[PDB]
């Protein structure tokens, strides 16, 4: 049920190698659908999903406008801060900017946020109310006091609670074929003997969307149970995800181990056990 | 639909 339209901007300065690098990416849920990169000599917002391919010419124009505006502001914000933190023009620095809205399982507005990070650390962070900020720093505090006027006038508020949600609903309808199709995991357990005393049991989930998933190993009876190595969810490269969970178990005890998988695409959660 | 800043740091 839970849906999000998020957007991720990265400005990176390039001392004496031309002017600063800028990149946008936008995601509906776990599916990137757009991209801007100013390193084109005619920079444009372009589609990165098949369901953005037959859009109006005005849509892309209006988004290319927003984008080149952000690149130019952030080109400045990099010089501005380099100042505040009294750093030379030799040091290459990083601005990252993140804004999105989140709906709940039940479809209602959960939260929005707009977030600034300089050299990998929080800088300006927008609060719950979408009106105040938590600036991390004496330097940030300057940039807080400069951003208060706009967010008093609910600039960020109206974008997040209304605009973002409105367009999130649009994009889901545009690409529902893929965005709202619950493709569940293909799940198999593999057996890898370590010695005569042991073997690794590995529980695979494969080719599932969305990326939310729970692989938990369970063992019948009272005995000990060695930690699971749980590898972090990873893209297949076709918009589906992969995860596995692995247990080192004593030899013979192997049939007592059962692997559980929860995911929306599964009617009821599945159990597997290594089938010899 | 993305948001361009109305302020600067």
């Amino acid at each position, epitope marked *: 049920g839970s849906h999000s339209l998020k957007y991720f901007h990265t400005s990176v300065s390039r001392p004496g190698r031309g002017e600063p690098r800028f990149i946008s990416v936008g995601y509906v849920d776990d599916t990137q659908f757009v991209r801007f990169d100013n390193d084109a000599a005619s920079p444009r917002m372009v589609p990165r999903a098949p369901w953005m391919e037959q859009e109006g010419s005005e849509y892309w*124009d209006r988004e290319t*406008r927003s984008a*080149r*505006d*952000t690149a*130019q*502001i952030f080109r*400045v914000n990099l010089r501005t801060l380099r100042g505040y933190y009294n750093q030379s023009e030799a040091g290459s620095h990083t601005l990252q900017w993140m804004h999105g809205c989140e709906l709940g399982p039940d479809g209602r507005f959960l939260r929005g946020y707009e977030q600034c990070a300089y050299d990998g650390k929080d800088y300006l962070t927008l609060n719950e109310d979408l009106r105040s900020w938590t600036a991390v720093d004496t330097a940030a505090q300057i940039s807080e006091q400069k951003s208060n*006027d*706009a967010s*008093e*006038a*609910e600039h960020q508020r*109206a*974008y997040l609670e*209304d*605009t973002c949600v409105e367009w999130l609903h649009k994009y889901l309808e545009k690409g529902k074929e893929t965005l709202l199709h619950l493709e569940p995991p293909k799940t198999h357990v593999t057996h890898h003997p370590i010695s005569d005393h042991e073997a690794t049991l590995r529980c695979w989930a494969l080719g599932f969307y969305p990326a939310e998933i729970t692989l938990t190993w369970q063992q019948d009876g009272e005995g000990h149970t060695q930690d699971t190595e749980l590898v972090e969810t990873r893209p297949a490269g076709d918009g589906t995800f992969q995860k596995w969970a692995a247990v080192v178990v004593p030899s013979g005890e192997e049939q007592r181990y059962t692997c559980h998988v929860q995911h929306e695409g599964l009617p009821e959660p599945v159990t597997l056990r290594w089938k010899p | 639909r993305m948001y*361009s*800043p*109305v*302020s*600067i740091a």
Partner: T-cell receptor
Framework: GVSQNPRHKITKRGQNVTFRCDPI?????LYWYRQTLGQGPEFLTY????????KSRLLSDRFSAERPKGSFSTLEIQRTEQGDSAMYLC???????????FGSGTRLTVVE | KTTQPISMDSYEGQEVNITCSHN???????ITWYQQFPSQGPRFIIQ???TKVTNEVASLFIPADRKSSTLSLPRVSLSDTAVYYC?????????????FGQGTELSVKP
């Protein structure tokens, strides 16, 4: 910040004219407005760098705007009429909203 | 769309209050105000959505309904003689392209 030359221009009705505008150095948006006496400015056309984006419907095709280098901008009125007599204002901003500054203008009078 | 008084008098010190009309204000529109001194082109003074905002230059009240909005100047001096415009849009759909009223001629007799 926002300088305009010439600050005054006269022309024989039928002749052309070409004012210029120099925006604040970093401002990537540049806008042209048009003020007749005791009114308020009408939008003519705006730019993002060298890119002329929107451009008012009513605006005659005698009027054309240019921002070749994405810095200075020139407005050109061909085969001028009485009506054209106005204060031609230029504005700059850093993207939408931030730093929205105007010029003092170019005062045009067109004479028979 | 934005209608206001065409002109307004005042005495020096006498606190001024222009008010504006925009029944059909969008859910997502910003009350922004510009001040044009004689001979120079206009400049920004204040912006609001719903909260009362205050500044060096002026204040801005916005009533519950949102239909109206009132610009407020203090200790009004000769200086303050100018045309005052009331704008309602979003930079967001517009672009930052401004739509100006005829404004309100303020005079400050001594």
């Amino acid at each position: 910040g926002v300088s305009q030359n010439p600050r005054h221009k006269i022309t024989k009705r039928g002749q052309n004219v070409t004012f210029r505008c120099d925006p604040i150095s970093e401002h990537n948006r540049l806008y042209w407005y048009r003020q007749t006496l005791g009114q308020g400015p009408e939008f003519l056309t705006y730019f993002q760098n060298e890119a002329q984006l929107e451009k008012s419907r009513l605006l005659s095709d005698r009027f054309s705007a240019e921002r070749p280098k994405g810095s200075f901008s020139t407005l050109e009125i061909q085969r001028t009429e009485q009506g054209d007599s106005a204060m031609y204002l230029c504005a700059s901003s850093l993207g939408r909203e931030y730093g929205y500054t105007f010029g003092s203008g170019t005062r045009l009078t067109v004479v028979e | 769309k934005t209608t206001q008084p065409i002109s307004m008098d005042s005495y020096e010190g006498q606190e001024v209050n222009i008010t504006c009309s925009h029944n059909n204000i969008a859910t997502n529109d910003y009350i922004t105000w510009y001040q044009q001194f004689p001979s120079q082109g206009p400049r920004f003074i204040i912006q609001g959505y719903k909260t009362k905002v205050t500044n060096e230059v002026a204040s801005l009240f916005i009533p519950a309904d949102r239909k109206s909005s009132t610009l407020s100047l203090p200790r009004v001096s000769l200086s303050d003689t100018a045309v005052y415009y009331c704008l309602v849009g979003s930079s967001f759909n517009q672009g930052g392209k401004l739509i100006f009223g005829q404004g309100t001629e303020l005079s400050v007799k001594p």
